[PDB]
Amino acid sequence: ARGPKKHLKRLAAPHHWLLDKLSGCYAPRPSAGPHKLRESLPLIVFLRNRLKYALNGREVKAILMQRHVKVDGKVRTDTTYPAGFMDVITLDATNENFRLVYDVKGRFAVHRITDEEASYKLGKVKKVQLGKKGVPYVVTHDGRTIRYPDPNIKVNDTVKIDLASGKITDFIKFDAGKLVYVTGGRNLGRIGTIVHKERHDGGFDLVHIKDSLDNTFVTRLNNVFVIGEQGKPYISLPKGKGIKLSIAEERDRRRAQQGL
Amino acid sequence: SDAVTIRTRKVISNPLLARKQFVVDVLHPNRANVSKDELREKLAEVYKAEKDAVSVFGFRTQFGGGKSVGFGLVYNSVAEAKKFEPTYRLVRYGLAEKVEKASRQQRKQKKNRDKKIFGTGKRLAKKVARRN
Amino acid sequence: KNSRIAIVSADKCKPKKCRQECKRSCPVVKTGKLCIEVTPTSKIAFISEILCIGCGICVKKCPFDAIQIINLPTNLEAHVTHRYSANSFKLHRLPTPRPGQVLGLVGTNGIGKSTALKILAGKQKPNLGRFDDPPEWQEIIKYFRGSELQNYFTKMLEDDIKAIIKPQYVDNIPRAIKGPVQKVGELLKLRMEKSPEDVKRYIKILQLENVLKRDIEKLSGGELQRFAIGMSCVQEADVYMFDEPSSYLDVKQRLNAAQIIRSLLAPTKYVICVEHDLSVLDYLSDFVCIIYGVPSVYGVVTLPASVREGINIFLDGHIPAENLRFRFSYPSLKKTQGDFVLNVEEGEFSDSEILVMMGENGTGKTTLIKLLAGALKPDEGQDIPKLNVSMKPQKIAPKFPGTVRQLFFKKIRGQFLNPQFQTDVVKPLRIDDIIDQEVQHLSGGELQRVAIVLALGIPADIYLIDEPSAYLDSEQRIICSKVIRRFILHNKKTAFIVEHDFIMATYLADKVIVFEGIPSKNAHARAPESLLTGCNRFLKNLNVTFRRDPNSFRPRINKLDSQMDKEQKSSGNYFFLD
Amino acid sequence: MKLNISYPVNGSQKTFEIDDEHRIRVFFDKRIGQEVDGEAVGDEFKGYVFKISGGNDKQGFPMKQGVLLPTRIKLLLTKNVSCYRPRRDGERKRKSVRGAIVGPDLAVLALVIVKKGEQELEGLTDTTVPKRLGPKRANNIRKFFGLSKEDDVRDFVIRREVTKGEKTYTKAPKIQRLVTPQRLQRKRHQRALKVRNAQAQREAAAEYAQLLAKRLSERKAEKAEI
Amino acid sequence: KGIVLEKLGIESKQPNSAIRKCVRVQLIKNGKKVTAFVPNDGCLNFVDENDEVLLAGFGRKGKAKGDIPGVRFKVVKVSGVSLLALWKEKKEKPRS
RNA sequence: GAAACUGCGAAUGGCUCAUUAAAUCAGUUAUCGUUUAUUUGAUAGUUCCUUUACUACAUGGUAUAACUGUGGUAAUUCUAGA
RNA sequence: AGGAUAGUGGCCUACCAUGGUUUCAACGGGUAACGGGGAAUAAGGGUUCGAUUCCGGAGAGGGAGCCUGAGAAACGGCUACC
Ligand SMILES: Nc1ncnc2c1ncn2[C@@H]1O[C@H](COP(=O)(O)OP(=O)(O)NP(=O)(O)O)[C@@H](O)[C@H]1O
Ligand SMILES: Nc1ncnc2c1ncn2[C@@H]1O[C@H](COP(=O)(O)OP(=O)(O)NP(=O)(O)O)[C@@H](O)[C@H]1O
Ligand code: SF4
Ligand code: SF4
Ligand SMILES: [Mg+2]
């Protein structure tokens, strides 16, 4: 209707922000940013709902406007800034560090990380082309272009990004024998290393994946994003380890064993 | 009054706002309601920061009686409390004083009148004076 | 709840072409009584008033949309803000004291306006047509919640909106408060708080510079109305009210009064005028707010309109809500008092004829009348009245406890017994309530009508009449004036009529004497000449002109200087179409 | 008709209520901009020469510049053009405006002047307005006094006091488009930044050549083995 | 909702021999001539010629109720009061 | 720090469903037939094309609102000159 | 083959060809028809409703045209006619 939509209601926003139906009509529309609208998570949502630091929007703004907190080690003062997958949220509150990584149920958990891990992040290369004056370049899932890459780095691979500098510290190739995370959709927040790839002419390369318990499954390659070598993940994984328990194991562990 | 017994459950320290945030639970048999002012007087026994520096807000009584739940804050210094706490709570605490000005629709009417005048508007008055 | 009624005439409301469906499908026509009377003919469809039940069935299936549907005024125990008891006046809506703009409040006389003003002030509190218990504000707030006044009235409860009103009547304010010292001087200083400069601006722009050294009691009602407004104005307060400010005052001095009222309005303040106006309400108010009903029975206030539009609807009648119809000799005497030189010239005071006076307030028209009756004077010579003298007072705020009927026994009802007082008023607006009921509780035009009777009441021919337009409007004024003229022309009398109103003078007038000179200095009464030249003389000095409203024959004062105004100044004529 | 005269040099101005049609028979059938002699009008304006700038006719409508026809016509009016001001951005409106041909129906001729005659007028000739905002920008300051470009700006600046009563002071104009240390620092920093960018691009492309060289060595020399 | 036209005396069918006391009504909206029965014992003397009455259908959805030929509507309110309230002496009818 | 100039915003929202039957619409692709303000990340050392004097690059010109004052019209967030 | 659009394209021009739809139901007419997500009822299958809190569409009295902006054919912008 005659241009961009600036407002956004509750309900229209995704289920994995854990937005309660009541206590408001509207939701925070994520601002135009690196990540997409539906996949990403606003900073306000990360603060008041998850971490429980702020109560109101006021308080959130008052926290953000005094610098302190920063995504990618950069000021980032806007309220509804889209913090997406695999982002370092550096805070000065008792030297606390946070990595956004997916959970069992496809949400963003409060997963703390070490001060050494805060240095670097990862990124799935979406295209690699020549820019102006024949200079090749890559582009990650979060738009962080890197000039003068290694010729080994082709499409669908992962890059380790240094944050402090826009550089390629490492790269990992796309095949079996590597630890392989999976985002997007039904099998969102799982790990199973790849068994084998499938070509399919005319788009959509369904990859076959096999977790630690050998409960194999298939997902689409656009939502697949690797991580590291077998038994050597370059990022510290959360509780659950990208396995996904059935409802039986849930009723055994999460409402029987854990009780006092 | 009997027992009283303040219990600050679900304690979170908040370095980024310079405060602590917590759930005040109170056991008050043989008295009607809890009273915020009395809790402000007696919360300094555990934390020690006078009264206005601390703050609190947020309560509700349990069904039946004898008990009250609530959600509250404790800021470290007074200045921080002044700058971070919402403006309306300060009035309740007696620190700030809200300028009780005109009605909302009245202000809107004023705004419309100001829209209807171009520039400063003293020129119009002067023109009228020359006219008569 | 209401009386729905049909209305007919239109642009090519064609009965000849249509095959008359109105007649063909009306329920009242098809059960005996002819409500809608029509044929294939040259004229319009005629439809009755009294018969029409309402329905609106003819409206839907008339082939052209000629016939509309209206709703007539009637009480239905709806709303009711206040009554007194029973077989008495009631009122339904008091409303939006809308701020930042002056609020006109118009109606035919004895309709509630004054009572509503009192209610708004919080002096005479409402009762919802019931016999309330000790301070029942709660209940009344609950009744008029869901609306603006909830806020207003609650504020009033804790006096965070201080009250002030200009009273209806003028003679009561000097008599009630017997001050230690008179003049403008000190009594104004005790009243005012605001500032030193604003009061200077007020008294200066009020063009008085007269009554700075003089006691209030001596002052004529006009210079006195002026003081009343001044005392209301300077009083430091939140609310502001002016209950009929522009009565018996000069045409020039009305406009600047209005523009002093205007002074108070802007910065988040509420103002509420009442007025029976010509077209000087153009400047008084921004939001005109008409009231309708029956005099001294029920009154309903319509939601506010724009001034222009509102005045234009008051004339025709129908509105977006309802429909209120609407439409021998004497020598040159030299008279003095203390701070005045009231001279008079010789004249021809002819038999079986009227005589018209005009002038600025303080031109000496009024004391003349007193001296003619009996008060003081003369030091050299006079002419005693041949006929028995008949007198009209201006300062009317009387006190005859008991009832008006008792006071009517001091006159007589059995003279020229054929209508007279009934021809003044009896069928449309009614006099039953006015003939009963106390005079203490009676309102302006009705109280004035009391004095219009005290004139053609005692046996007398030679008549002294100054300011009957006091507390009356276009409805009550014109017919009353016509009746007065019919009286004194038919049965052979002589009357010295004195008006501030233009229509009440010019529709009567023939011989016109003109007062001239500055207030609290001089006064010269010029001889009776033609109606045109005399009126020019009256208005050349005042420096104001009129415009006859072409459709309805109605006066509209000009805006000090203008394109048409200057033509009138250069030509001379201030009255078209005789 | 009323007249409104204004002398541009002194910055004075006054109205004149001029009745009698014979006194104003010269002004009729003339255009805005044309020069008119005041001797034919009367003795007070003898010697003067008047240029007309604008005017208003009856009902307060202005005279648009050189638009012809002595009648009010409905015209589209946009931003940055006379006899209109837009509220909303790019808002064009149709308004009835009169032409520049002077006729009987006029009310105020907005008369200016050209030459001052033998007789001196009452208001205009004597008084002179103090021109309010003195030169703000540096170059305009330098052109007002006539200081070439080596006299310094801080000492030669247009002034105005402010006597309150108790405690007196004297606030001055800010200057724009003026040299300081700060701007020199900024330009220097800009150039430096550009240089650093260039060097960073030079250093970056060099390593690419070495990596490429290594790729050619390891890969292309390995083809000789098979 | 409708006005009226006149009171009737409807000759009922066999075997149910009586007179039913209905009203001819012209409506507001279309303005069609309709016949309508008046419920309860007595209660025809409440309504008069020309009067705002709110009608309801019988129950049967079109056609006769029981023994009344042509009549396919009853009443509900007259002068906006309800016949049921009037029959049972609860509420009062306004004069106009 | 009112006013005004500039820059943004006012195309979001909120409201109603009259038209509209392969049209809207849902799921589902595609743009290797494209525009994309703004965020987000990268990004033009080579313009005095006589870079031999060429005008200042210690950084230069054209106006113009608010404003002071003179008014026009019955009137609208009408506006004229100086 | 051009023009026009940010663009493909009968979208529109000039020339040339005689096609495209259809009783597996075109074309017309009606709809008290905005389309979905849904709601009511429920053995199972169904039947009726969906103006209405979410997505999408359309229109701000009727039509038509346009300025300005990245974005409108905007209507708490403009323009004319009814
Ligand atoms: N206290 C009272 N007791 C009995 N009757 C009253 C009382 N107050 C008012 N009335 C009646 O109510 C009517 C209207 O009152 P009011 O509002 O004063 O008239 P009004 O419309 O202001 N007249 P005016 O100002 O001359 O146009 C009058 O006709 C009185 O007869
Ligand atoms: N003893 C006195 N000393 C001084 N002045 C007096 C005295 N008595 C009366 N006056 C005033 O002298 C004036 C004579 O004017 P007057 O004839 O009353 O004008 P008017 O016809 O009343 N016009 P208006 O005020 O419009 O009614 C009056 O205004 C009186 O107030
Ligand atoms: S009103 Fe309608 S119906 Fe009655 S006459 Fe005029 S046209 Fe024929
Ligand atoms: S309105 Fe009701 S009554 Fe008056 S005419 Fe039309 S139908 Fe007959
Ligand atoms: Mg009254």
XYZ file of C-alpha atoms (C1' of nucleotides) in Angstrom, chain D residues 2 4 6 13 15 53 55-57 59-60 83-85 87-89 95 107-108 110 132 137 139 143 177 179 183-184 187 195 197-198 201-202, chain F residues 5 8-11 42-45 56-63 65-82:
70
model
C -4.725 55.238 -1.076
C 1.945 53.744 -0.190
C 8.721 54.079 0.260
C 7.943 54.923 4.084
C 0.904 56.275 3.039
C 6.667 47.673 -7.725
C -0.186 46.919 -5.550
C -3.572 45.744 -4.225
C -7.031 46.324 -5.721
C -11.194 42.936 -1.963
C -7.428 42.758 -1.085
C 1.780 36.279 -4.775
C 1.633 32.904 -2.989
C 3.148 30.797 -0.183
C 2.091 25.047 3.094
C 2.703 21.498 1.827
C 5.746 20.547 -0.208
C -5.864 31.681 -6.829
C -7.002 50.486 -3.819
C -3.284 50.699 -2.937
C 2.608 50.107 -3.920
C 18.742 45.765 11.124
C 29.419 36.405 6.588
C 33.258 38.375 2.812
C 32.860 44.341 1.317
C 32.605 30.876 6.108
C 39.090 30.498 8.724
C 38.891 23.939 9.704
C 42.576 23.617 8.750
C 40.833 19.521 5.797
C 45.935 9.008 1.680
C 42.730 4.690 2.229
C 44.905 4.761 -0.905
C 44.332 -0.329 -1.056
C 47.895 -0.472 -2.411
C 15.099 28.493 6.863
C 13.463 14.433 7.608
C 8.221 12.751 8.629
C 3.428 13.216 6.845
C 2.761 6.823 1.394
C 32.674 -2.245 1.616
C 33.944 1.881 -1.382
C 36.661 7.428 -6.274
C 44.696 9.932 -3.483
C 42.086 32.442 -3.092
C 41.964 26.934 -1.470
C 44.371 29.697 5.255
C 38.933 27.626 1.906
C 35.435 32.055 -2.424
C 29.851 34.184 -4.763
C 24.003 34.531 -5.531
C 20.058 35.441 -2.999
C 12.635 33.741 5.298
C 12.095 35.073 10.436
C 12.808 40.361 11.367
C 11.775 46.570 11.509
C 8.327 49.458 9.351
C 4.174 51.069 5.347
C -0.570 48.787 4.001
C -4.491 46.013 1.241
C -9.562 42.956 1.969
C -16.195 41.335 4.675
C -13.628 36.848 5.119
C -9.542 31.169 5.186
C -3.038 28.674 8.624
C -5.105 35.395 1.924
C -0.776 38.176 1.517
C 1.596 43.110 -1.237
C 5.486 46.107 -1.514
C 10.308 48.651 1.091
